[PDB]
Design an enzyme around this catalytic site. Structure first.
Site, PDB file in Angstrom:
ATOM      1  CB  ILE A  89     -15.371  -1.865   5.592  1.00  0.00           C
ATOM      2  CG1 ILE A  89     -16.424  -0.976   6.269  1.00  0.00           C
ATOM      3  CG2 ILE A  89     -13.962  -1.442   5.962  1.00  0.00           C
ATOM      4  CD1 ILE A  89     -16.516  -1.167   7.747  1.00  0.00           C
ATOM      5  CG  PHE A  92     -16.056   1.328  -0.719  1.00  0.00           C
ATOM      6  CD1 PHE A  92     -15.997   2.149  -1.857  1.00  0.00           C
ATOM      7  CD2 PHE A  92     -17.152   0.500  -0.534  1.00  0.00           C
ATOM      8  CE1 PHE A  92     -17.057   2.161  -2.757  1.00  0.00           C
ATOM      9  CE2 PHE A  92     -18.201   0.503  -1.445  1.00  0.00           C
ATOM     10  CZ  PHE A  92     -18.132   1.317  -2.567  1.00  0.00           C
ATOM     11  CD  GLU A  93     -11.176   1.981   3.959  1.00  0.00           C
ATOM     12  OE1 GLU A  93     -10.040   2.375   3.471  1.00  0.00           O
ATOM     13  OE2 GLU A  93     -12.082   2.773   4.377  1.00  0.00           O
ATOM     14  N   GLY A  94     -10.114  -2.159   0.360  1.00  0.00           N
ATOM     15  CA  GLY A  94      -9.215  -3.148  -0.221  1.00  0.00           C
ATOM     16  C   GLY A  94      -8.570  -3.986   0.876  1.00  0.00           C
ATOM     17  NE  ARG A 219     -16.391   4.213   2.900  1.00  0.00           N
ATOM     18  CZ  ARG A 219     -15.315   3.700   3.471  1.00  0.00           C
ATOM     19  NH1 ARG A 219     -14.148   3.810   2.859  1.00  0.00           N
ATOM     20  NH2 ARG A 219     -15.413   3.076   4.638  1.00  0.00           N
TER      21      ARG A 219
END
Ligand SMILES: [K+]
Length: 240
Positions: A89, A92-94, A219
């Site tokens: 996560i 992909f979210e940073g 993702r």
């Protein structure tokens, strides 16, 4: 009735019994029945809750000291997501340590946490966040999604922690309503091999605005790889 503190919900009315789940301060409980057990702060009254486990009645705000309802005469919380799931996560979210200073619309912080106010002050950690507090924030946020995954997948369908974490990441991204109507859930519940289902279904979730999004392809591929990562730890249904 609200619990007055972080309150353990046990398998028997006893401070020695196993913890099934913990209710955070202010959480509502409904009392099926009451019984006596270990004395807690001068009261030996224990309440069987909506989850079938027992809490010390001293810490439930009912207006009663004695037993006031039927005498008696659980359901495990979904686990936290594992390290590998957190890592996916975060990829992909940073990471955002603090809210954008004067944002247009509502900002994000941490690992994909959408704030409810522009100041984001309702987040219970100091800004800037660290990797540690971003992870705690994520563990709180992800409970919605582990809950709905664990709800919609039949309890006869065993998922390991990697499989469960991959679905939690997907669910967080697409929302619970989309999980509920997904072919993924349907095929898992029809008893199809989970790794096959995941590999075929997750890559379908790549469209935004009628257009294939490269970031979503990436993702879904990472979610598939995590899903298939071997593990002997069962995560769904929860054990406690
Ligand atoms: K279920």
């Amino acid at each position: 009735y609200p619990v007055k503190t972080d309150l353990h919900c046990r398998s028997s009315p006893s401070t020695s019994a196993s913890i099934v789940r913990t209710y955070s301060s202010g959480t509502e409980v409904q009392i099926q029945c009451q019984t006596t057990g270990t004395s807690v702060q001068g009261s030996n009254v224990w309440d069987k809750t909506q989850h079938g486990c027992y809490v010390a009645d001293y810490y439930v705000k009912t207006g009663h000291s004695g037993i006031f309802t039927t005498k008696c005469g659980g359901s495990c919380k979904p686990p936290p997501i594992n390290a590998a799931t957190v890592a996916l996560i975060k990829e992909f979210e940073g990471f955002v340590p603090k809210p954008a200073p004067d944002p247009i619309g509502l900002p994000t912080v941490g690992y994909g946490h959408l704030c409810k106010t522009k100041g984001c002050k309702e987040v219970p950690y100091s800004f800037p966040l660290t990797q540690e507090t971003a992870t705690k924030l994520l563990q709180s946020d992800i409970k919605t999604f582990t809950s709905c995954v664990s709800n919609y997948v039949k309890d006869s369908v065993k998922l390991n922690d990697n499989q469960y974490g991959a679905l939690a990441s997907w669910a967080f991204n697409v929302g619970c309503g989309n999980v509920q109507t997904s072919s993924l859930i349907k095929r898992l519940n029809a008893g199809e091999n989970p790794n096959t289902v995941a590999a075929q279904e997750l890559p379908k979730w790549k469209y935004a605005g009628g257009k294939v999004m490269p970031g979503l392809v990436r993702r879904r591929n990472a979610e598939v790889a995590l899903f298939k990562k071997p593990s002997s730890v069962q995560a769904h249904p929860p054990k406690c």
